[PDB]
Design a protein around this nucleic acid. Sequence first.
RNA 1: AUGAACCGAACGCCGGGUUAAGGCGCCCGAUGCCGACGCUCAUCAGACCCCAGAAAAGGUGUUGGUUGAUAUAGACAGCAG
RNA 2: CGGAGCCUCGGUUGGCCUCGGAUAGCCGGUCCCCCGCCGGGGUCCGGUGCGGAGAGCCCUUCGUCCCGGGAAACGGGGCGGCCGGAAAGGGGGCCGCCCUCUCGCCCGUCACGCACCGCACGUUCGUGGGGAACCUGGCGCUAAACCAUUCGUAGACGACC
Lengths: 199, 128, 176, 109, 138, 50
Amino acid sequence: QVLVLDGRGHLLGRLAAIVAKQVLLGRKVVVVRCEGINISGNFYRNKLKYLAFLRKRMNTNPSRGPYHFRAPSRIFWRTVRGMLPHKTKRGQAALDRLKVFDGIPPPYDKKKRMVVPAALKVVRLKPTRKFAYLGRLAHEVGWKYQAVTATLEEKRKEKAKIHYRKKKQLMRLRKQAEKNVEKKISKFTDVLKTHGLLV
Amino acid sequence: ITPGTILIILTGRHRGKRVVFLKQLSSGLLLVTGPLSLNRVPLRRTHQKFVIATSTKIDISGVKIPKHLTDAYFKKKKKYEITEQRKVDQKAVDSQILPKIKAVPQLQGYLRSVFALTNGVYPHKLVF
Amino acid sequence: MKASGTLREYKVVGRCLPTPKCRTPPLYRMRIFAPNHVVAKSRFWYFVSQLKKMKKSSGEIVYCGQVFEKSPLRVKNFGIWLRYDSRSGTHNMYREYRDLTTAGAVTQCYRDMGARHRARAHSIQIMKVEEIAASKCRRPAVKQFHDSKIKFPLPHRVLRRQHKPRFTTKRPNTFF
Amino acid sequence: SGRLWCKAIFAGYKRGLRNQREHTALLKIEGVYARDETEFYLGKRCAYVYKAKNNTVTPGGKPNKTRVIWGKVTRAHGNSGMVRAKFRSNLPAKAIGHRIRVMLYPSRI
Amino acid sequence: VFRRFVEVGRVAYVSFGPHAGKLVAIVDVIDQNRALVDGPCTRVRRQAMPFKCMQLTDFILKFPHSARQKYVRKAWEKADINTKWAATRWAKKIEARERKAKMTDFDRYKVMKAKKMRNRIIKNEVKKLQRAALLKAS
Amino acid sequence: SHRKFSAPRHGSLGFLPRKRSSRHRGKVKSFPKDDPSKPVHLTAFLGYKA
RNA sequence: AUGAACCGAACGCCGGGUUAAGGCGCCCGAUGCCGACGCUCAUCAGACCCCAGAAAAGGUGUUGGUUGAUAUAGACAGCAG
RNA sequence: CGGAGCCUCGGUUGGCCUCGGAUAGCCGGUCCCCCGCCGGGGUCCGGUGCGGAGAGCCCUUCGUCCCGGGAAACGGGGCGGCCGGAAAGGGGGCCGCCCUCUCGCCCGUCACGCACCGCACGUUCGUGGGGAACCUGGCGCUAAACCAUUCGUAGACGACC
Ligand SMILES: [Mg+2]
Ligand SMILES: [Mg+2]
Ligand SMILES: [Mg+2]
Ligand SMILES: [Mg+2]
Ligand SMILES: [Mg+2]
């Protein structure tokens, strides 16, 4: 009942629009591994645009000025917020529905991440164009936790690799079981085959 | 909707259950009845609009329903009490319907089961 | 005129009204392309007025019919001569296309001319369209397709129908 | 012994960019995202179920705190499967992005 | 590398468009994104067809790029494309997809009952193999 | 108009919140980076000005 | 977006339907079309009458077109006499 | 830790318990092969509009009664030990127990269950979150802050040491 969207390979604004609309529909959407978000254009132009965003600041009192968050998750959260009427109760409620995290926390690492093809880089961008990684851009602009997040990602990928090996051996045992038991489950298989479920 | 088809009741107290359809009454309603031994459905009227009809029918052209039951027979009188004639007619029609439905494999269990919607089940996509 | 959809080739003949000076004015036939005969006749009068001393009132239409492609099932290379107005000054062009129908080639000519030179339909006026053999073709973009043993794959299959599986768990494959 | 109504999301009112008409509501029925698939749900009964503070009468059962606002589905709205619905009373704005039941007893099959 | 090449004489499955789901053999290539196609044995008229709506398969029949539909039928029937398509795995799962879309309500109940027992049998066979693996390991 | 004579700015904005410190004893914001090669040792101590 | 003059269109209180001008990634109703044909790399891109900002000049960035040339009597290069 | 009710707040109407990653390439087996703290690479074999398919997978709820056929006999339910978790920690697995069954599932026979007489919010995650005593029993608990006074590294008053 809660969407878990993988941020790897997703264009920033293209994914944000889908997330914002889905949240406005009342869904609970969580975006994971925001450091894998791609942004169109060359990396220099993207960082130049963000540097201009940094320069834009209230002059008399910077404490009241625009809050430039450096974490990739909060950058994505801000860009989703820009697509919502956050000045209203429904907009703030939608922002409360949305939860954004950098990396893959333990509450969501054991689940399966969803991918939206409508915002995928390899679908919505030509192979000859240049793109920038949000995590690399954030580290360039002042994110202080690229290395620790990378180590944590490495550790969980290793653990997930072990889990995938066990899943593979379970599947192999299942198919061996099916081959050995087809003699006494034949009448329960042809029905599915005739109804287009096992062909 | 043809005589001998299977219907799904959605509104009344017997909602979501699959019932056998007999004929159209003079009041415009559908005279429906399931095997009471299967899904606890007596000889009951139902509305054509409020009923979903599926593509599973049995040939009941060789059965004879009693002609003494009509809209006045099923009209409400005024705690409710079951008359002896209701049980007699229900047994008389069950003795002709139940053996016929039992010819079709796995039909009694289907009638005993109920209809429900799970996740990913959409009436527009599914065809019954 | 605007090239709305595929154009249709119209054969239109016209002549001046009979006058006490001359009983039988000459009949003039033109090949035109237009969305429908209503604008086709307007284009014919525009060209005839620009060519001869004939006008809408001083003349009249005779027959405005549609010419169908004689061989719509054979791929043909078409050379099209154009005379359009640019930002400053007008130019004469010769462009080669490859299509089954003459009208379709003209439609494609209107499309890519507007794409490449911003030349709108009212600026573009057609003068001569004919079927040109592959040997007589000159543009390499058209000559490259003149190969009996032509063979090429589809390298990158961009994923269409994006929003049907909109929320899925599978990374799409572009190799087939 | 299960759900007998389709799930719908109250997207909003029938509105323009600067105006809204509250007598018509826009519903997003789960599963259907096209005009050729929204034809089935035309004419169905759409009900918005919500709870209250004090008890109210319930037909065929003990009175409880649940209340509904009945309505019908008029016609399609756009190419994305969005549909229009009209209720006996205009739906409150609290229901934006909330579940609305689409019944099946207004059947046409 | 690549294994499917758009060449004169290759059949192709059609995903969407007018004649969706019917194999058509390409006769000649018109432009970069449009080619002439004709299915003589499946009631598809000779017409232009963009590449984006046709999925080329690994079936090639030899005939010149300007051959008439008369020859294309002869090549199609001699190659026996229809039976080969019926036998391939691709059409089998396409037809299975159509079957499961055509599934009624009563038979859906029957399949649900059948698959429940099938999963039960498979699951206990798996776990009785797992314990055998455990005791073999120790 | 512009300032007639250029002068350096009075004070420093790096210590802009000139407020009374919340904590009494001065706390260490950052210890020196640790390296496994060096032996284990303390990096801070506490004394009283005399 | 914003707006005394711009586009449509003028107004009793309402229901249903359909439009003009303008629009359909999100804010924001509507393209969540398996939309068509091409151009475009910007380390200051571009994004709709009035309108809210740009010129002459140049580019071996890239595309189309025009004209004049030379090449199996073996050319433009390129490396040598 | 081990019972019944009242007031208020609302939506919700089955879960999917996980590789990484490429997209001018992948996926799964495989040793007949070589190295490494079972993993990696090479050979070979099956698919690729992905079937080990999110166009997907699991459970599926009317019940009880008797007898019969198919699967289980190694399992279903509930008492002790062993590990697995730290980015915001897993109500998971394994080994023995004294109790219990051929009931649990898949098809056949038999009848019954207010058949509430066509008519709406039905069906749940609900021992849901917050509050007041009614409450019977068990294991542990008798604290700190503030004001006042002093201090004076501090200070307009507060504040602070
Ligand atoms: Mg100065
Ligand atoms: Mg005007
Ligand atoms: Mg109106
Ligand atoms: Mg707008
Ligand atoms: Mg409820």
